[PDB]
Amino acid sequence: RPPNIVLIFADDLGYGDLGCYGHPSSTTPNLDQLAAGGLRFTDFYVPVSLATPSRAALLTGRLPVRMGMYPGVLVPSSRGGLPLEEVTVAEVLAARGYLTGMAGKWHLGVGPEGAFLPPHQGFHRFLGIPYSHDQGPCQNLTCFPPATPCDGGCDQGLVPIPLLANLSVEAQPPWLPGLEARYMAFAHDLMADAQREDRPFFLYYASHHTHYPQFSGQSFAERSGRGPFGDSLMELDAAVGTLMTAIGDLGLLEETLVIFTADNGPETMRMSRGGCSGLLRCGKGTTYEGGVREPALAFWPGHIAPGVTHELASSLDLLPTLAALAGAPLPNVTLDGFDLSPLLLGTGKSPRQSLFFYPSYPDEVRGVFAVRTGKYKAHFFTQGSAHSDTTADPACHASSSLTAHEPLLLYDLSKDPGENYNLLGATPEVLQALKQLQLLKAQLDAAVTFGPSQVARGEDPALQICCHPGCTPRPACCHCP
Amino acid sequence: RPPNIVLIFADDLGYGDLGCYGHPSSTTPNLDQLAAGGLRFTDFYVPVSLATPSRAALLTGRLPVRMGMYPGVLVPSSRGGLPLEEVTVAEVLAARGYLTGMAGKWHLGVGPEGAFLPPHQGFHRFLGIPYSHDQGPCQNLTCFPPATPCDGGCDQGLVPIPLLANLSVEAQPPWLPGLEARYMAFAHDLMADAQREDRPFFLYYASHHTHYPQFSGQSFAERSGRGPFGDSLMELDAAVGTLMTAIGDLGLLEETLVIFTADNGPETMRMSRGGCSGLLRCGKGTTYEGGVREPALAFWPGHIAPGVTHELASSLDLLPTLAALAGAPLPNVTLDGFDLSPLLLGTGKSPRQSLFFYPSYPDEVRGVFAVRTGKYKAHFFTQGSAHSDTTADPACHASSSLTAHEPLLLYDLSKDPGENYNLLGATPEVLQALKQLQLLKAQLDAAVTFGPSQVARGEDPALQICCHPGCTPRPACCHCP
Ligand SMILES: *[C@H]1O[C@H](CO)[C@@H](O[C@H]2O[C@H](CO)[C@@H](O)[C@H](O)[C@H]2NC(C)=O)[C@H](O)[C@H]1NC(C)=O
Numbered sequence: 001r002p003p004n005i006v007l008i009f010a011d012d013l014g015y016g017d018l019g020c021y022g023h024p025s026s027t028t029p030n031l032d033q034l035a036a037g038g039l040r041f042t043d044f045y046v047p048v049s050l051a052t053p054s055r056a057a058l059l060t061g062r063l064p065v066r067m068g069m070y071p072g073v074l075v076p077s078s079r080g081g082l083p084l085e086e087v088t089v090a091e092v093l094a095a096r097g098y099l100t101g102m103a104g105k106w107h108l109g110v111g112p113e114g115a116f117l118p119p120h121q122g123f124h125r126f127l128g129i130p131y132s133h134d135q136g137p138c139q140n141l142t143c144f145p146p147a148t149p150c151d152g153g154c155d156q157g158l159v160p161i162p163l164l165a166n167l168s169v170e171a172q173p174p175w176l177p178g179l180e181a182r183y184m185a186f187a188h189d190l191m192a193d194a195q196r197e198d199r200p201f202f203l204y205y206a207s208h209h210t211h212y213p214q215f216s217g218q219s220f221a222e223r224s225g226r227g228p229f230g231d232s233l234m235e236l237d238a239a240v241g242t243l244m245t246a247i248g249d250l251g252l253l254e255e256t257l258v259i260f261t262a263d264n265g266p267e268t269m270r271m272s273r274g275g276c277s278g279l280l281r282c283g284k285g286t287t288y289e290g291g292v293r294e295p296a297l298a299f300w301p302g303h304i305a306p307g308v309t310h311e312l313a314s315s316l317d318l319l320p321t322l323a324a325l326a327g328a329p330l331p332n333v334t335l336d337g338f339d340l341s342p343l344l345l346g347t348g349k350s351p352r353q354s355l356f357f358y359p360s361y362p363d364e365v366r367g368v369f370a371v372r373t374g375k376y377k378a379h380f381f382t383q384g385s386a387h388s389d390t391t392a393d394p395a396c397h398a399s400s401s402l403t404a405h406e407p408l409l410l411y412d413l414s415k416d417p418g419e420n421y422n423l424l425g426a427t428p429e430v431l432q433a434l435k436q437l438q439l440l441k442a443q444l445d446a447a448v449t450f451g452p453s454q455v456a457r458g459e460d461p462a463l464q465i466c467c468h469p470g471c472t473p474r475p476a477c478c479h480c481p
Numbered sequence: 482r483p484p485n486i487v488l489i490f491a492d493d494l495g496y497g498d499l500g501c502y503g504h505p506s507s508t509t510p511n512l513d514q515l516a517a518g519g520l521r522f523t524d525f526y527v528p529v530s531l532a533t534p535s536r537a538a539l540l541t542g543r544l545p546v547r548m549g550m551y552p553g554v555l556v557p558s559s560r561g562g563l564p565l566e567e568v569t570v571a572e573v574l575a576a577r578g579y580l581t582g583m584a585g586k587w588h589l590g591v592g593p594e595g596a597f598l599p600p601h602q603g604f605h606r607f608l609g610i611p612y613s614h615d616q617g618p619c620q621n622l623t624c625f626p627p628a629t630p631c632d633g634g635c636d637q638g639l640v641p642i643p644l645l646a647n648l649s650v651e652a653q654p655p656w657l658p659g660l661e662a663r664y665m666a667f668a669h670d671l672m673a674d675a676q677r678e679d680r681p682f683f684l685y686y687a688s689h690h691t692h693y694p695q696f697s698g699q700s701f702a703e704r705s706g707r708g709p710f711g712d713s714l715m716e717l718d719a720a721v722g723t724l725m726t727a728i729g730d731l732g733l734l735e736e737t738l739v740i741f742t743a744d745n746g747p748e749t750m751r752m753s754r755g756g757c758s759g760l761l762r763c764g765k766g767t768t769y770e771g772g773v774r775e776p777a778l779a780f781w782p783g784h785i786a787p788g789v790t791h792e793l794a795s796s797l798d799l800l801p802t803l804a805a806l807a808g809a810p811l812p813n814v815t816l817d818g819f820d821l822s823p824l825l826l827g828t829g830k831s832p833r834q835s836l837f838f839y840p841s842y843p844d845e846v847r848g849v850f851a852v853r854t855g856k857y858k859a860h861f862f863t864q865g866s867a868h869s870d871t872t873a874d875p876a877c878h879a880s881s882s883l884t885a886h887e888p889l890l891l892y893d894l895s896k897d898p899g900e901n902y903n904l905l906g907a908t909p910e911v912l913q914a915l916k917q918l919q920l921l922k923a924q925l926d927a928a929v930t931f932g933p934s935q936v937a938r939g940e941d942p943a944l945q946i947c948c949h950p951g952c953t954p955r956p957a958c959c960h961c962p
């Protein structure tokens with residue numbers, strides 16, 4: 001039968017944050033053990049280094065511009081959302097009869113009467129926050145018990161963060177030192193109900209770690225030895241340990257595929273309360289490797305042998321791989337990913353040779369910003385971001401503005417993953433890579449027409465979720481902790 | 482009985498070059514397996530990030546300025562050398578009756594009739610090159626067989642590189658695609674003779690990898706998928722695999738302690754033919770973490786359990802640990818390291834709380850440049866280096882000149898290992914760290930008197946080794962390949 005699937009997606013976590021990706025001070029013992037008994041990717045990517053667009057791509061296997069998920073990210077007042085018409089992974093697995101569930105951050109739209117909420121896009125069960133946890137004021141929230149407050153305040157002028165159960169406000173705001181526990185219990189129940197009914201489950205655990213502001217429950221506060229960002233990552237790692245114990249307990253180890261990855265690179269503007277891209281350059285919000293190249297682990301005892309692949313892979317390849325693996329059929333839409341099951345099961349290579357990267361603010365005159373083929377990556381356009389400010393590398397700062405490069409900038413990632421030495425600063429291998437990259441951009445730009453933007457549909461304060469509907473004064477009357 | 486000891490010391494290799502320290506493209510399967518069954522350090526250091534001074538410190542357990550090993554490094558014409566009077570590790574183990582042997586780079590002086598060569602400082606056996614392999618012309622050497630030449634030429638105006646056997650020129654220059662093989666065989670014989678005579682051996686394998694220029698034998702050329710720097714590191718890794726097979730073969734696994742580390746950070750001026758410091762800042766020649774913080778593995782089946790320590794350690798601590806472990810007595814000299822055996826054997830903590838860092842060009846008016854206590858590191862002086870040029874971080878370049886900092890620059894390495902956020906840009910933990918660091922520098926600077934420099938004793942071309950003594954014209958007549 002099709003396997004049970006657990007998909008864990010961390011938030012704003014970098015390529016060099018796990019212990020097993022080199023960090024000297026992180027504490028992530030469950031993830032290290034999951035890498036030690038599974039496949040660790042060195043070259044897995046996401047196509048855009050922001051939250052919404054990354055989350056859309058993972059769930060539909062489709063580049064975000066195809067469906068209007070740009071520019072920037074959605075906010076609480078947002079009129080727009082991932083069209084209902086797109087077929088998510090949960091829609092696909094639901095129809096093969098999976099009990100589907102999601103815990104955590106959705107950030108894929110809310111809408112008039114919550115029409116874009118997960119329960120409309122194929123999850124049977126949903127306990128979570130519908131957008132990032134810092135999108136609503138937090139100067140009064142506790143981030144670390146007993147009463148260490150969240151740092152800095154978060155977004156102002158908005159309803160507190162709502163924890164939701166399907167479409168109902170279960171709390172507003174929730175108590176952050178307790179979210180993990182709520183989420184483990186929801187996960188545990190979903191698994192056990194699925195055993196109960198003889199059916200495979202699909203759990204989508206989209207953690208809030210390690211997005212700003214950092215938080216954790218008391219068993220982690222001040223125990224990772226890397227400060228708040230670590231306490232928070234140690235908690236995500238202990239949630240993973242929990243899912244894994246529960247998989248043990250129900251005797252489901254060899255029947256569950258478990259993937260871990262993250263939506264985008266670190267927010268280095270948070271300084272030492274943000275993540276680390278390791279040897280890679282820059283972070284969140286850019287098309288440099290540090291923003292789009294993420295950690296990725298695939299673990300399935302008895303099906304995937306412990307190792308390290310350098311094959312190309314993308315979050316875009318998850319719907320199709322999982323569809324394949326569960327004998328479910330693919331939507332009748334154009335897809336930008338591929339089935340990676342041969343690579344997972346060790347009977348093949350990855351079919352993916354290229355990757356296309358779009359910036360946070362794309363546009364049809366400029367098209368794709370960077371393309372990777374084999375070991376080479378070309379950048380046609382370059383640009384820093386305020387999510388990546390504060391590091392010593394000036395190309396990452398928001399003062400590095402949009403600059404065009406013709407001839408393109410060319411890096412061989414196998415020797416210069418750090419993207420330091422432009423090879424066009426000659427050889428025949430180089431001229432052949434340049435001609436291929438130039439043609440893959442012109443091909444893609446000529447063939448993709450952007451979907452009309454969801455984010456420019458604007459904002460309506462009246463779409464903000466409220467615990468005490470119709471109350472007054474808005475937004476402070478919404479609440480019910 | 483005291484264990485057999487193998488000490489492997491790589492050259493110009495960075496903290497993020499091993500596969501197990503995060504690199505995405507290196508191929509180092511034996512070292513990864515050695516980490517997987519042993520202790521991987523995250524915070525091991527060397528006190529100066531140049532070759533000579535690092536090599537002096539490791540062998541004597543003493544800060545290089547105590548014995549005149551500054552500034553810069555020794556050259557072939559150098560009149561000076563590590564005084565005979567210093568007691569090396571090999572001297573110490575010899576007197577407890579170890580069969581002692583060294584293969585590889587010595588760079589600790591040559592002298593009039595080779596008075597500073599290893600055979601005078603306690604090794605019974607020596608097959609190697611007495612200084613770096615690029616210190617003599619290489620435009621005509623082959624670096625990768627069948628006939629790929631070394632890149633760039635190396636040093637000019639000098640005798641070719643001599644391979645030596647005790648004090649005799651066995652070759653000049655040697656064939657670089659064959660060094661590994663010579664070195665494995667010498668190592669194999671030394672082990673097996675030591676079994677034969679019922680005595681513990683001490684092998685000091687100081688590889689030439691991954692110093693410029695890169696080279697390897699044909700089984701590695703073009704097979705690591707990271708280019709020449711990788712082919713070269715893949716060869717060092719396959720030498721490690723060989724030592725390990727040989728340890729197996731003689732049935733010596735649980736009686737041999739094996740340590741791996743490297744003398745100093747990467748030479749990023751070699752660009753993509755140089756190493757990678759990972760998330761750490763800068764490289765070779767600086768007192769930033771990327772120049773002084775090195776990979777370090779301790780492997781001893783049945784004595785050291787597989788893990789990861791974050792305890793402080795230094796190359797300075799090796800003589801005393803090994804002396805302890807072999808029940809040999811310590812020289813009657815002031816030592817700057819400590820016995821780490823409790824940490825190795827899991828019955829203790831490291832005794833080391835502080836580390837003192839000197840620059841490549843030290844002086845008694847300025848004294849130590851950086852000090853680490855617990856998780857904090859202070860920099861009293863900062864400075865870039867031409868060994869670290871070419872990266873995006875401007876503080877590493879040789880155009881960043883010697884700048885004093887009062888108040889000191891203060892970093893908490895557990896949250897900011899990358900040395901980005903000066904904490905003095907307030908708190909009581911901070912003021913207490915500042916006062917302690919300021920006092921550890923003034924204490925050390927007032928108590929260490931520098932030894933008179935060996936390197937300023939000057940140069941005599943006549944000290945250059947010659948295969949065909951008395952020939953003419955010097956230096957090209959020296960040779961005998
Ligand atoms: C809200 O929606 C779902 C689905 O209706 C709730 O559903 C589940 O709850 C019970 C068992 O866990 C059963 O009464 C329902 O059959 C079951 N539904 C399915 C399809 O499994 C759920 O409790 C709410 N979501 C969550 C967990 O918050």
Ligand SMILES: *[C@H]1O[C@H](CO)[C@@H](O[C@H]2O[C@H](CO)[C@@H](O)[C@H](O)[C@H]2NC(C)=O)[C@H](O)[C@H]1NC(C)=O
Pocket residue numbers: 580605606607608646647667670674
């Ligand atoms: C040069 O010096 C050493 C020591 O004299 C040589 O010594 C070893 O060689 C033989 C066995 O390997 C024996 O004849 C000697 O007893 C032995 N010496 C010791 C003390 O072990 C050695 O071959 C030369 N160095 C090397 C290996 O190059």
Ligand SMILES: [Mg+2]
Pocket residue numbers: 011012050051263264
């Ligand atoms: Mg995100």
Ligand SMILES: [Mg+2]
Pocket residue numbers: 492493531532744745
């Ligand atoms: Mg060196």
